[PDB]
Each structure stands twice: as C-alpha cells, then as structure tokens.
Write a protein that binds this ligand. Structure first.
Ligand SMILES: [Zn+2]
Ligand SMILES: [Zn+2]
Ligand SMILES: [Zn+2]
Lengths: 227, 64, 196, 111, 175, 208, 161, 48, 56
C-alpha cells in the first residue's frame, strides 16, 4: 500500500470511521482488543486555536525545591490554591555564568481568587483594571532542555459539555532547584529583584492582536486569515 | 602542630623556582607560604582537608 | 570507590572515590556536590531507597560529616581540579574548566559524553554506593569472580580490531609528521607519498 | 530515620539548650532549629535481626526456580505456597524457612 | 554484538520511563532497567515487559543472541547486547498457564518432518527453528533465572543394571 | 527566622495583554502531559488531500518507507467538514476512549493505544512572554501519560517490529573492488619522480 | 500430537551442525571485522587538521584531510617481474607467501583559507580461510579438487609466510 | 555531671551463660574509669 | 530448584561406574577430578622448593 492513492484512501477511511460520542449503542459496540471491555465515555481530540500563538513550557521542581516539601512556604501560600495557580516567574541573568528565576505570588486569598476568576472567565471584551501586587517568595536555580521536534510533548485539557479534548504543544522543560545565596553577593542580590510587582489588566492592543492572529494563521486560516 | 614542607612552587616576585616552603598549622587553622629568597610571607585560612596545593592556589588568586 | 575503616578501627568509616587523572582519593560527598547536587537530603535520596534502613544511614553519617566543609558546586569543582594532576599553578577559572572536562568526560564514559546530561551519572554513583554499602553490611554475598556469565571471549574480530586501531593511529601520526615536514616547501604533495 | 532542615535540606544535628534544658535539632548552615520529640539521640545494635525477613517482594511468586510447597497459609489458607531460607547470609545465619502464599504473600515460619 | 538502539526504542515504547521522571520516595517499588550495564530507566510492571521482550526475541524481531535477564530478588531487569558472550541453545517448554499445552515442549513432530524434508509447507533449517519460537539461546547469566529439564522424559511425573534418576522430592511440583 | 532579603519595595507597573480563550476548564485546572511516541504523530495543520497525495515520497529503503507510511497513517489530523445545513464544522479523526476500568486510550482510526498515567507533583504549565521576559502560569500538570500499543496483534506494533527487525539486518560498509596492478606502484613511481626533482632542484640551487 | 524421542533430538542437532558448522565463530568474527569494523576504526578519527596563520597579510590557512570509504579486494599476488594475479591458499602455502588482501582508503584533502584524492593503499590485511573474503568461499566441490584443497578442510586460520 | 545518658542492654541469655554478675560488670567499669562515670545497673529480676 | 540441600543436589553420586553416571553426577565428579589434578600440579612445585631448601 505504498501507492499515494492507497495512503490517501486510508486517510479518508480513518476520517470516516470516527465514532459519534453521543451514539451510546455504537460506543458500546467498540470493545478493547485485549481487555475485552466495553467503552463508557468518549471525547473528540482537537487542537487549540487561541493558544498556538503563545509559548508553553513544562516547569518542574527538582528535589528539595518541591513546594509540598517546603512546609513554611506552603503554609504561607495556602495549604488547589489560587495563589499557586496565579504565580509569576521572572528569569533574570546577570551574566552567562550567573542565572536564576524569581517567583512571585498573591499573598491575599481574596485578591488571588478574584484574579483567577477574572482570568478564567475571559470570553468577552471587557476587563476590569485589577492592579494586583505580587510579592516575591523564593528564587531557584534553573536549567532548560529544548525539544528538537515541535510537538514532542503535548498537554491534554478536557471539555465535557462539548465532548472534546484540546491539546497544546510544549516547547521545552524548565527545572528549578533550591539555591543558597552566597553571603558575599547579597549586596548585588538586593539590586536585582524587587519586593513587589504590580500587574495591571488591560485589553490587548489592536496591533498586537493582529500580530497574534497572523501567527495563528498558520494553523487556522478559515477564521483568522487577513483580508 | 605546625607542619613545614618544601614545595616546588614558583615565587611571583623573585621568579626563583624551588624556593617555596609551606607552613600550615592545623591547631590554629592557618597556612604560611614563605619564599626562601624573597622572605615574603603569605597567610591564608585552611580547613581540615587543606593541602599545600590549596594554599598555593589561594596565593595565586590573591596575587591576581 | 573504596570504603576505608576496618571493623571498630579507623574511627569513621569514610568512603573515598578514585577518579581518573586524579592523584588522591576524594570523599564521595565532594564528588556528588561536584556533579551538581549540593543539599544532603537530595544526596541521601540518590543513594538510599528506604529511609527506615537506619544502618546504611549511620554508615553514611561519617561521609557527610567529613564532606560538610564543602557546601557549593564551584568550590567542589575547584577542589577536584586542584588534585587533577594537571599543570601546577593553574588559575581558578581554568582549574574549574579542567574539572568540568575531567568530570563530563573520562568519568563513567560508557554512560554519556554530552553536556547537561549528568543526572544519570549521579544516579549511577548512587547505585554504586548502594551496592558497596549493601555488600559491606553483609546483606549480600560479594560478587563471584569466577562466575562465567561475567566473562567475555575475544575472537579474531576484537583482537584484529585492537591491533588495527593501534597500527592505524601509528600511520596517522606518520602522515601528520610527513605533512608538517613537507608543508615547509609549500608543494602540492600527492598524498600518495605521505602514506606508508 | 533522621530529619533534615525544611528550608536548607541539610542534616539537623542534636543540640541542648543550657538555659532551657531541652533537646533540639539545629542545622549548621542555617539558624533553623526544631524541638526534639524523642530522647533516643543515638542507638547502636550489637546483634541485629533486620534484613532477615525484610527481603520480600510482591512478585516473588513468579520465580520458576523457587520450590513450591503445600504448607497452609494462616491468612488465605491456600494449598500452594513458595518457601525460601533467610536472605541475610552471615556465616552464623539460621536455616529457618520463610513461606509466602500466592494471594496474601504473608511471611511466616513452621516454628 | 548487536546495536542497542532498537532495544531502547522498544523499552520506551512499552512504558519504560526515563530517569529524570524518577523520584526514589515515589517509585519505592519500581524495577530498575539496565541495558549493556548502564541504568537507563525504571518500570513499574516488569512482568509484562519481560514477557513482551522475550516474545519479541522468540519471534525474531530482536536478535536471538540478545540476553534478557530478570532478577526478581534484586528488582532489576538487565539486557545485554554485548559482544563475546558464550551462549548455547535449549528447547522451550510452554509455561503459559492459560495455554492447553502447558508444561510441554513446543517442538512437535511437524517441525521434525519439516527439518527432514528441508522446506516448509506454505529452506527450513536451524534458523527457522530458532525464529519460530521453539529453540532459544541462553548465556551464563540468563541461566541463573531458568529451570531446565535434563530430558524430555523429565517433563512428566527394580533393575540392578539400569541407573537411578534423582528423586527430586523437595518440590511438590515443578514448572 | 530567615529574614526577608528584599525590603526595598520597588514595584513595576507592567500591564500584560491577555486574549480570550476558546474554551475554559471546568472544576479543575488540570492537564495531562503525554509523551509522543515515534509511531504516532500530530498534524495540527488542516488536512489537505491534494497536497498530501502530491507529496507522497517513495524511497528505495524499504524500512524507511514503511516507517513513513506507518507514521503517516497513524498521524493525528483534522479537516473542515461541510455540514448538511451549509455550515462549516471542525472534524477530527482522533478520539479518546475511557473503558469500564477507568483507563484511558488514544484512538486514531481503528488503532487503539493505551495510556499509562503516573502522578506527578509540583509540575505546572506556564505561558512564555518573551517580549517582556516573564513567565505566566497556565495550569497544573498533575499526571504524566505514556502511550503504549494495545496488543501484539495490532498492525502498528507489527509494522514497528518489522521495521526494526529489518533495519538491523542491513549492515555492509566496506565496498569490494578489483586490483589490476601492484598497489605499491604509485608510491614507487612518485618517489622516483620526487627524487628526480630533488636532484634537479639541488643542481639549480647550487647554480643559483 | 506425538512424543519427541532421542532420535528427533539428534535430527535437530544434525540441523544445527548443517547450518553452523564447527568453526562458525571464527569465520563470523572475522567477517564482522572486515565488513564493518575496519570502516568504524577509520572513522573513529576522521579528520587530520593543520592550520597556519601566515604573516610573511594575515592569511589563516587550514589544511585538513578526511578519510572516506574502505575498499577491499580479493587476495592478490604481485610477482617480482610486475605481473599481478589472483592467489589461492595452496600456492601461498607452497611458496611461503602470505594470504592477504590490499585495503584502499579514500582521502579527501581540503584547503581552508580565511584572511583574518582517491583510493590510496594503506596496507594488506591477512584473510582467514573460508571466510567471506576468501577465494574458496565460492568454487563448489569440483573446483576445490582442482585447486588441491581438501574438501574436509574447515578454514578458520590464516596463512602467514 | 552531664545530662547525657549512656545506657546499654546486656543479653540476659549470654550473661547467664558466661556465669557473670551485673555487680561484677559494674565493678569492672568503675575500676577502669575510677569515679569519672556514675553507673547504675538493673537487678537480675528485671525483664531486661 | 533453589535452596535444595538433598544429597543428590550437592554432589552425591548414587550410582556406580558399572551402572553409569547421570549428567549431573558426571559434572560434579568432573569438578572433583579437576580439583585433584590442580592440587597435584600445584603442590609439586612447593614440595620441590621445600626439598631444595632442606638439602641446601
Ligand atoms: Zn621570591
Ligand atoms: Zn541549613
Ligand atoms: Zn493465599
């Protein structure tokens, strides 16, 4: 079946044999080849259109840098916590040899909850000016490994109401380890990071939105091509 | 107990070689490099695992 | 990886590792920090796999106590480089680079050679230390030297390969020397005369 | 099992407060200090038994080279069991057998 | 001697997870995996993995001289593709409990008659026997983990001249 | 009490542009990171049958051609499907199936690949903002998922086994050749010419 | 089915010896060495590099030579008069020759310059008898007698002098 | 005196087998260490 | 099987030379004979050295 016509025919055959998630009878017809177990639920597998412009990195804590292991840190930031779900990271590099990552979070639970609700409910064109102040928590040493292929890793998100599953590409993996600051460099350390960072929520500019749409035009041109 | 050892290091002021003697005192945690010709003395702290190479490297770093 | 200290002798039972192109033995905690794992909890995670095994922990205690003096990656690399049997008087930056060279390469070369790929070396050091302690605690019999499953036989292939590698390196050196001698004339050497 | 500093990850060493007459565990690279719960600072066993029955795995019943017996399991009361002698192999080790059933995997002896 | 890249590919395909995704506290029961003496990863269900690798080797997908060893006591699963390992062939006994042919030699008179003829009924030699899953090579390290019968007569349960076979009464049953 | 190092209070008034999301997770901001196997590929681009048919490549190497065919037929794709009512809908050839035991499987066509999930803690997903040099978190990666073929009899597994078995069979680097003359003839003739020009050069230099 | 007797075991062993032989390990090892090992040994160090920052006008010239394919040939005898002909082991034994074959290497020379080559003969490798590169691998049974070679000879050895 | 307590448990079986007395062990320790260590020993009727 | 201390599992040849040895007994007996040969070939040199020293 090396014939290009055969490959194309296989492609349309695979496309046509997709099982309707609402079809309970056809879903029960499908049986696991080895487990011999009926199917219960199904989800469509689709890519995500609004997120391809952004760049996604899998961030992990290595060893003692675990937030669960750091009991005082967890107690201060809350024993899922919205503060963790709204944290900010600031990579700063003095020189090629010296590098670290700065972590910021919202200490107040009410402010973090309001910010998380506003961020997760962005489906309209009205955003309130939430001047949220982020407080520094800790710094970690960082190393990065890049993926040779574009879609080497992909994260899967679900949507039960639409019976879909949206996946997003992962560009690289960032690892963080606990770093003990040398006592002889605290003078420059105090001049590197900041005690607070203020985030202001504003609607994206028209030019930046057009740039992001042009970037997304590679994936979906039917709904985003410039005219 | 102070330990006196003859070392083959090179003095950076007189340029004579094989005229360096390392004196380390583990009791007071100190190490002295003295030039047998220049009579210059270099003092640096030492640890439990310190060796004459450690004091020599410390002297090299101090020199530059 | 030698385990010093006899039964009820030699005070602590320190563990000193031996590295290639290094004149003196080095305690295991120092080399672990040199690879880039400075906290002690992470090192214990790398070595042991059961926190209830207090015997191996108390065996490891003297090593941690001895290596407590070094508490950073760069200082550990400098300590490794100082004894690296290289030229005397090497600057601190060049000493650290020499240590990185001798640590990435020539240290368990069969595992890897590329940069940023040293976690596997740390895990293998943990495995070796685990095996050493496990046999020291008499929990397992020492590996049988006569076990025929641990032997290999070199047939005509490997023997001829070794000999040919030696001879071809000799031929390459001869070509190099002839090229250096003959470039002085700036002539278009046939390259059919350089070879012997 | 010994603890470590929760912010420095280094080993915590026991310490005594002269003014308070209390045992504490203090890190050496940091000022962190935590109260000690147990008074057993150090313990050394001259004669030990650990490593005798601890050598158990869940899938030891998949080894074909192990003999199969018919001893009665206290838990499952199965008719099939696998037995082996002590994993600890000191020169003065006893030759007692440890029997493992295929369902509950409980280790027991015929003593 | 064989390249180890296909072995690593198969191991990664069949669920082995690399070292950077490993934490000793978390995977307190996983099995280490060695390939040619280097620790390459960990696995949580070594039984199905060793079954799959052995079946692949018997089907000819993996080179028959590749050594597959499982050390259940030490929780290790070693693989060797090195050069210079002395091996020898052995018959294969069907040890699957779910199979009706349990406890019997896989080779049958059909294979013998095919060998005698010299061809299959839609060249049939020793290599065909090895790749058809009736004979396999084992080295000195894989022999540690197998139970061998001396003769096909040993596979099933008063003369002064004939010799005496071992009683082997210590084991209630053999597999 | 490790006193806080930073007490300057300096603050940045940076405002980040955020775009509305086509979908929103419900009940939990959880995502599963899945490693992509070699036999499975993702084609985010909409399926274009004519370029696909016109760009099929044929190679002499049977193993490479079979691997390419397998990855192409197993690649996850999508295309625009014209609805019977005249509208346009996104149609995909890939689905996720959950069995009665609770396990999940990735399905492409008739092929089914099982999912092996390992729980991972302190693993999160972030969004990179390179122009501002800061990282904005997105959600939490709770589980790492591996994709495994369902059974031996699966066509994908058999094709992979065939490709890998025949890949290591082909090994012949040295190329044979026929010698018609003495292999040492070139060296001796060139040495003779070199000695001749040495003599000529010595004479010229003595005459120069 | 039917039971397997001892005679069937001997049938299987006969099949084994029909395919493998008694000295198969020597021949297999040598075939592996000749087919792939020599090329990899050459490619272990595939570059010889010389550089020169000529100021005698900064002209940095790099002279680099690369090693290419390995070409092997059947064993050949070169007489004193100059004629070359195929060599068979019996002639080597009778005349105290060495049963070896030439090895040819491709060398490519490059002249890198920044202002700021064919099959060369490297040696002769002795050939193991009855291996893949021996002249007796072919020739069937009848021609083996014309070459004064015993059909019972199994190979697996070299002929040096 | 120091608060640091140093105690050790003697195997009753071998202690009986060697026909030794707790008082004898305490006396030996006292003789080898004079009065530098305060020593208390459990009675023979104790469980351990 | 593992952990088998029966007489036939640790080198007790039950048969006689007339009756013939089973393969396991054959291998164990070969091991013992090899030990005998090695012991002779090693002790001869030590005894020779001892006698030379005594004579001198
Ligand atoms: Zn001087
Ligand atoms: Zn600390
Ligand atoms: Zn049971």
């Amino acid at each position: 079946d090396t014939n290009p016509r055969s490959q194309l025919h296989s492609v349309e055959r695979t496309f046509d044999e997709v099982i309707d998630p609402r079809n309970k009878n056809r879903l029960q017809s499908l049986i696991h080849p080895r487990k011999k177990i009926k199917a219960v639920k199904a989800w469509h597998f689709f890519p995500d259109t609004s997120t391809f412009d952004q760049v996604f990195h899998s961030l992990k804590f290595v060893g003692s840098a675990s937030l669960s292991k750091d009991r005082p840190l967890n107690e201060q930031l809350g024993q899922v916590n919205a503060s963790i779900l709204t944290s900010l990271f600031k990579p700063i590099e003095i020189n090629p040899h010296n590098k670290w990552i700065s972590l910021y979070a919202v200490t107040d639970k009410l402010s973090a909850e309001s910010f998380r609700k506003s961020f997760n409910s962005i489906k309209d064109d009205n955003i309130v000016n939430r001047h949220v102040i982020y407080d520094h928590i800790k710094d970690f040493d960082q190393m990065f490994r890049g993926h040779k292929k574009l879609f080497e890793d992909f994260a899967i998100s679900f949507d039960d109401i639409s019976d879909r599953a949206f996946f997003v590409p992962i560009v690289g993996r960032l690892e963080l380890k606990k770093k003990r600051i040398v006592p002889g460099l605290v003078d420059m350390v105090n001049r590197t990071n900041y005690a607070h960072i203020r985030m202001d929520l504003r609607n994206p500019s028209t030019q930046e939105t057009a740039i992001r749409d042009s970037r997304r035009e590679q994936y979906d041109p039917v709904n985003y091509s410039s005219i | 107990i102070k330990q006196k050892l003859e070392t083959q290091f090179t003095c950076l002021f007189c340029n004579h070689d094989n005229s360096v003697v390392c004196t380390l005192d583990k009791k007071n945690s100190i190490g002295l490099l003295e030039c047998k010709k220049c009579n210059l003395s270099f003092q640096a702290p030492i640890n439990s695992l310190s060796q004459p190479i450690d004091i020599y490297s410390d002297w090299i770093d101090a020199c530059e | 990886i030698k385990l010093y200290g006899r039964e009820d002798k030699g005070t602590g039972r320190t563990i000193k590792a031996t590295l290639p192109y290094v004149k003196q033995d080095i305690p295991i905690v120092i080399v672990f920090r040199a690879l880039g794992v400075v906290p002690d909890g992470e090192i214990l995670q790398h070595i042991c796999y059961d926190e209830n095994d207090w015997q191996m922990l108390e065996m490891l205690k003297p090593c941690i106590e001895e290596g407590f003096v070094i508490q950073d990656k760069e200082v550990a690399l400098d300590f490794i480089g100082r004894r690296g049997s290289a030229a005397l008087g090497i600057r601190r930056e060049k000493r650290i680079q020499y240590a990185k060279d001798i640590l990435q390469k020539e240290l368990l070369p069969h595992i890897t050679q590329e940069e940023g790929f040293e976690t596997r070396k740390t895990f293998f050091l943990g495995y070796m230390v685990n095996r050493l302690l496990l046999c020291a605690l008499e929990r397992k019999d020492q590996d049988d030297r006569d076990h025929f499953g641990k032997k290999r036989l070199d047939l005509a292939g490997p023997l001829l390969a070794n000999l040919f590698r030696i001879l071809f390196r000799k031929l390459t050196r001869e070509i190099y020397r002839y090229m250096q001698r003959c470039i002085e004339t700036d002539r278009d050497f046939n390259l059919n005369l350089a070879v012997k | 099992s010994f603890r470590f500093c929760l912010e420095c990850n280094n080993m915590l060493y026991p310490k005594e407060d002269k003014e308070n007459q209390r045992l504490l565990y203090s890190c050496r690279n940091c000022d962190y200090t935590e109260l000690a719960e147990d008074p057993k600072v150090y313990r050394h066993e001259l004669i030990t038994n650990i490593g005798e029955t601890a050598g158990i795995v869940d899938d030891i019943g998949q080894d074909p080279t192990l003999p199969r017996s018919d001893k009665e399991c206290p838990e499952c009361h199965s008719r099939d069991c696998v037995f082996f002698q002590s994993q600890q192999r000191r020169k003065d080790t006893n030759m007692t057998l440890f029997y493992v059933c295929l369902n509950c995997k409980k280790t027991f002896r015929d003593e | 001697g064989s390249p180890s890249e296909p072995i690593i590919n198969f191991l990664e395909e069949w669920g082995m997870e690399p070292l950077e995704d490993y934490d000793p506290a978390q995977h307190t029961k996983s099995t280490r995996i060695f390939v040619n003496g280097v620790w390459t990863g960990i696995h949580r269900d070594p039984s199905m993995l060793v079954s799959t690798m052995r079946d692949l080797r018997r089907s000819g997908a993996i080179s028959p001289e590749v050594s597959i060893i499982r050390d259940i006591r030490e929780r290790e699963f070693k693989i060797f593709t090195d050069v210079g390992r002395v091996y020898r062939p052995l018959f294969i006994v069907e040890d699957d409990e779910s199979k009706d042919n349990k406890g019997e030699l896989r080779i049958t008179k059909e294979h013998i008659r095919k060998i005698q003829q010299g061809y299959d009924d839609d060249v049939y030699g020793w290599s065909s026997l090895v790749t058809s899953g009736v004979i396999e090579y084992v080295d000195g390290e894989e022999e540690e983990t197998i139970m061998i019968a001396m003769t096909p007569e040993d596979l099933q349960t008063n003369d002064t001249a004939k010799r005496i076979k071992p009683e082997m009464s210590t084991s209630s049953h053999h597999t | 009490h490790t006193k806080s190092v930073y007490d300057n209070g300096e603050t940045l008034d940076i405002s980040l542009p955020i775009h509305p999301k086509s979908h929103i997770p419900q009940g939990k901001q959880d995502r599963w990171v899945v490693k992509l196997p070699d036999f499975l590929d993702i084609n985010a681009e909409p399926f274009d049958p004519r370029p696909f048919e016109m760009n099929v490549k044929t190679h002499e190497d049977k193993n490479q051609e079979l691997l390419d065919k397998l990855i192409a037929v197993n690649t996850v794709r999508w295309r625009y499907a014209k609805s019977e009512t005249g509208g346009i809908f996104k149609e995909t050839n890939s689905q996720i199936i959950q069995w009665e035991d609770g396990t999940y499987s990735l399905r492409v066509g008739s092929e089914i690949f099982d999912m092996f999930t390992t729980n991972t803690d302190d693993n999160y997903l972030v969004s990179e903002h390179n122009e501002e040099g800061i990282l904005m978190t997105e959600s939490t990666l709770s589980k790492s998922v591996k994709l495994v073929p369902a059974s031996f009899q699966s066509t994908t597994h058999q094709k992979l086994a065939k490709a890998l078995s025949a890949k290591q069979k082909k090994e012949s680097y040295a190329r044979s050749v026929v010698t018609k003359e003495d292999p040492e003839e070139r060296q001796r003739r060139l040495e003779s010419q070199e000695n001749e020009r040495y003599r000529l050069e010595r004479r010229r230099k003595q005459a120069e | 089915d039917d039971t397997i007797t001892t005679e069937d075991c001997w049938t299987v062993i006969s099949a084994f010896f029909e395919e493998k032989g008694l000295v198969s390990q020597q021949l297999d090892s040598f075939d592996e060495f000749m087919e792939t090992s020599i090329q990899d040994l050459v490619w272990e160090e595939p570059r010889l590099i010389l550089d020169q920052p000529a100021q005698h006008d900064n002209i940095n010239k790099r002279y680099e030579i690369r090693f290419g394919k390995i070409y092997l040939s059947r064993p050949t005898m070169t007489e004193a008069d100059g004629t070359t002909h195929a060599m068979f082991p019996q002639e080597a034994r009778l005349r105290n020759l060495t049963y070896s074959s030439p090895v040819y290497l491709d060398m490519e020379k490059s002249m890198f310059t920044s202002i700021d080559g064919n099959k060369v003969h490297i040696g002769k490798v002795p050939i193991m008898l009855r291996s893949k590169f021996c002249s007796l691998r072919t020739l069937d049974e009848v021609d083996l007698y014309k070459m004064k070679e015993c059909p019972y000879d199994m190979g697996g050895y070299f002929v040096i002098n | 005196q120091s608060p640091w307590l140093l105690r050790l448990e003697l195997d009753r079986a071998r202690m009986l087998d060697k026909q030794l007395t707790m008082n004898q062990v305490a006396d030996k320790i006292s003789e080898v260490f004079s009065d530098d260590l305060f020593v208390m020993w459990s009675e023979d009727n104790a469980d351990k | 099987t593992k952990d088998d201390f029966s007489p036939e599992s640790k080198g007790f040849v039950e048969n006689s030379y007339l009756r013939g040895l089973t393969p396991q007994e054959f291998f164990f007996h070969a091991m013992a004979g090899r030990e005998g040969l090695i012991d002779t070939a090693v002790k001869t040199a030590e005894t020779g050295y001892i006698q030379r020293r005594l004579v001198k």
